[PDB]
Design a binder for this molecule. Structure first.
Ligand SMILES: Cn1cncc1C[C@H](NCc1ccc(C#N)cc1)C(=O)N1CCC(C#N)=C(c2cccc3ccccc23)C1
Ligand SMILES: CC(C)CCC[C@@H](C)CCCC(C)C[C@@H](O)P(=O)(O)O
Ligand SMILES: [Zn+2]
Lengths: 312, 401
């Protein structure tokens, strides 16, 4: 009704329609700790919030005030709660509220309360029709907002809106092949629609991923993906694997190729294989290269894999 | 210094000439960090890593008393401000005046809800994040008074009020669900001894569903592995004595991959940037994973170090995450706050102190005055406060009903 930013904004205490109420001040106790020095404006709106809430005044003016209280501190979950109560009680137009939360999230896309509030509205309305488009707009400003991806998976799961998400994932992977949120989304999607058991799908995936690897060899996500989709069946159940990867040794090498090989070898050992003695030698040498030369930040881990590779 | 060495410069980012928004940003942090590293060479002084403990103490000491309106945004996280400050002081081995501790106790009592749990400030609805914080604070103080602020019979009611059929908990009534709720509940319930037989029924199973294809744990099943959530999940399982509900092998490969070869500090997600608070959320996962693995009798485990570069993480923090005026931070350029102060310090301490039964290989970088008091890898409060609290509440019966 009256912006907190308007040049002609007036304190609630100075308001004619807010004189019947007495502003309830914060009680931090006679001897405060981590005490915030609020602005006259922040203190004003909240002294009034404490009161309306304390009265449980479920009024339209109370409604318009949570709006200001939310703008002063969007992370105030108590105000967000009372606002949902007013939404039900005052029987407010929720679509109109969808627009509000839409704008607020655009402003604070990393706030926990705003996303949750939006999810509550969509549930109340049983309407997921604006979701994928809104999310995509947020992910357009920050392709890795955790809240955005999480909210997205909920809309897709709950409302079973799976059909065009893999096409979306592919789009974003074209924009930033290093976007781990998208690699994860691709897994979320495939594993919930077709699964990776389907030979054609598995092949299509490994192919595509071997591509992104033999394109940006030092991009870790593609590596953790390829490993992720195969390691759940045994890397050693894939003979050609060790080869193709061994082929990339001088053309597309990173400590990821070495680490993947150390992972295959591990499985060709769990499953027992002829030449196992040499295999173990090759694998331990790789563990020392990674540990001593190739990837020393985790020398504690790499030598530990050398020692475990001993016992098992 | 591991970092100022000449071969370490090969740990620089391999762009593959295929530059994306991610390469670009990573490369940007790397240059700002390189500068810090080379800080010495250019100026002609000998490198001397030192923890501006007094400057940090004066910062913390002030914030425990009052904050500017710049903190209006954490007006619903006050028990957190107590915990972050009262824990940084705790690690800096600084004093907690018998009068200030009381005020804190008195204030938290005002934050506590008649329905159990704690709000973000006087009069706010209880929420598990502030509850976790309030309880940790009260334990850091650790006196009949502090402990006595906590209403255990009401805390169980509250915990049960958030409990979900699938094993997860809400963060608050009408609030969201994600792993933080599981760790928060587990941490406060265990410390105060209110864990009934069915309290966490199915909780270990939900938390295990959060572990994805990366080896890491996400906010909710299906989500990307994230360091703050992986700490919540693992630590929650350690409490419930169910670490084994996870694939610890892959979790280990995942966490260890999160340390930045060039920067030394940790990242919260694969292909994201380094951030000082993750010095604890991510690095804290190795001590947790030591116990876990040794628990299943693992032989290949070290008797002196954690499965991460303790040296590099201490250099990153000391060199790159310290604010001259006091307080620690995300990375160079970023502003200082009590959250990063509390977590860069907690991580330094993890990096400086090892344990493994009766083994004790501390590693203190730079001036030996840089060593911090120890912190428990599950509660993130002094291991002594933990032990002292649990046992004190242990002489109380679990609120049976
Ligand atoms: C940009 N940035 C870098 N590191 C952290 C952030 C932003 C944000 N932190 C919020 C915050 C800022 C200052 C203080 C102080 N003093 C306290 C909190 C962030 O990335 N998150 C998002 C998700 C999240 C979660 N979950 C956070 C969090 C974790 C643990 C305890 C909290 C208590 C209160 C508020 C946020 C948190 C922090
Ligand atoms: C006990 C706890 C409250 C732990 C919280 C741990 C965290 C730091 C969680 C971070 C939550 C998320 C999803 C943050 C993301 O916005 P980002 O990775 O960009 O920082
Ligand atoms: Zn941070």
């Amino acid at each position: 009704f009256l912006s907190l930013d308007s040049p002609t904004y007036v304190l609630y205490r100075d308001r004619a329609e807010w004189a019947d109420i007495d502003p309830v001040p914060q009680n931090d106790g006679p001897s405060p700790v981590v005490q915030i020095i609020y602005s006259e404006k922040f203190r004003d709106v909240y002294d009034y919030f404490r009161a309306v809430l304390q009265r449980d005044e479920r009024s339209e003016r109370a409604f318009k005030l949570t709006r200001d209280a939310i703008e002063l501190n969007a992370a105030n979950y108590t105000v967000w709660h009372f606002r949902r109560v007013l939404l039900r009680s005052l029987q407010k137009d929720l679509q109109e509220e969808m627009n509000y939360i839409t704008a607020i999230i655009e402003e604070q896309p990393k706030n926990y309360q705003v996303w949750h509030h939006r999810r509550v509205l969509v549930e109340w309305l049983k309407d997921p029709s604006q979701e994928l488009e809104f999310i995509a707009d947020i992910l357009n400003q920050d392709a890795k907002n955790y809240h955005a991806w999480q909210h997205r998976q909920w809309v897709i799961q709950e409302f079973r809106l799976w059909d065009n998400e893999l096409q979306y994932v592919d789009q974003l992977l074209k924009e930033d092949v290093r976007n781990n949120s998208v690699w994860n989304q691709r897994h979320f999607v495939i594993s919930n629609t077709t699964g990776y058991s389907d030979r054609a799908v598995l092949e299509r995936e490994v192919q595509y991923t071997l591509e992104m690897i033999k394109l940006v060899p030092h991009n870790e996500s593609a590596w953790n993906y390829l490993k992720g989709i195969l390691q759940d069946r045994g890397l050693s159940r894939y003979p050609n694997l060790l080869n193709q990867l061994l082929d990339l040794q001088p053309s597309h090498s990173s400590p990821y190729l070495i680490a993947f090989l150390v992972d295959i070898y591990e499985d060709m050992l769990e499953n027992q294989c002829d030449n196992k003695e040499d295999i173990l030698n090759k694998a331990l040498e790789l563990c020392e290269i990674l540990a001593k030369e190739k990837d020393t930040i985790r020398k504690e881990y790499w030598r530990y894999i050398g020692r475990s590779l001993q016992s098992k | 210094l591991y970092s100022l060495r000449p071969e370490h410069a090969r740990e620089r980012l391999q762009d593959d000439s295929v530059e994306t928004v991610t390469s670009i940003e990573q490369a940007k942090v790397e240059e700002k960090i390189q500068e810090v590293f080379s800080s010495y060479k250019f100026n002609h002084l000998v490198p001397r890593l030192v923890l501006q403990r007094e400057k940090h103490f004066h910062y913390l000491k002030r914030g425990l008393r009052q904050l500017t309106d710049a903190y209006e945004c954490l007006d619903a996280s006050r028990p957190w401000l107590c915990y972050w400050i009262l824990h940084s002081l705790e690690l800096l081995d600084e004093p907690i005046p018998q009068i200030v501790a009381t005020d804190v106790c008195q204030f938290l009592e005002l934050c506590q809800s008649p329905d159990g749990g704690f709000g973000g400030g006087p009069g706010q609805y209880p929420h598990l994040a502030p509850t976790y914080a309030a309880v940790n604070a009260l334990c850091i103080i650790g006196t009949e008074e502090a402990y006595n602020v906590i209403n255990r019979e009401k805390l169980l009611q509250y915990l049960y009020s958030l409990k979900q059929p699938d094993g997860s908990f809400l963060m608050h009534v009408g609030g969201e669900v994600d792993v933080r709720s599981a760790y928060c509940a587990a941490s406060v319930a265990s410390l105060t001894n209110i864990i009934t037989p069915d309290l966490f029924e199915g909780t270990a199973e939900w938390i295990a569903r959060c572990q994805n294809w990366e080896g890491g744990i996400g906010g909710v099943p299906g989500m990307e592995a994230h360091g703050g959530y992986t700490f919540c999940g693992l630590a929650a399982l350690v409490i419930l004595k169910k670490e084994r509900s996870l694939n610890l092998k892959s979790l280990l490969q995942w966490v260890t991959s999160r340390q930045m070869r060039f920067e030394g500090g940790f990242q919260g997600r694969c292909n994201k940037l380094v951030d000082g608070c993750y010095s604890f959320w991510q690095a804290g996962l190795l001590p947790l994973l030591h116990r876990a693995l040794h628990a299943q009798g693992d032989p290949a485990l070290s008797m002196s170090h954690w499965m991460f570069h303790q040296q590099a993480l201490q250099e990153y923090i000391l060199m790159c995450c310290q604010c001259p005026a006091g307080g620690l931070l995300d990375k160079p350029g970023k502003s200082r706050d009590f959250y990063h102060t509390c977590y860069c310090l907690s991580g330094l301490s993890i990096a400086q102190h090892f344990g493994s039964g009766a083994m004790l290989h501390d590693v203190v970088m730079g001036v030996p005055e840089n060593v911090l008091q120890p912190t428990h890898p599950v509660y993130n409060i002094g291991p002594d406060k933990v032990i002292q609290a649990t046992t004190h509440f242990l002489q109380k019966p679990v609120p049976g009903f």
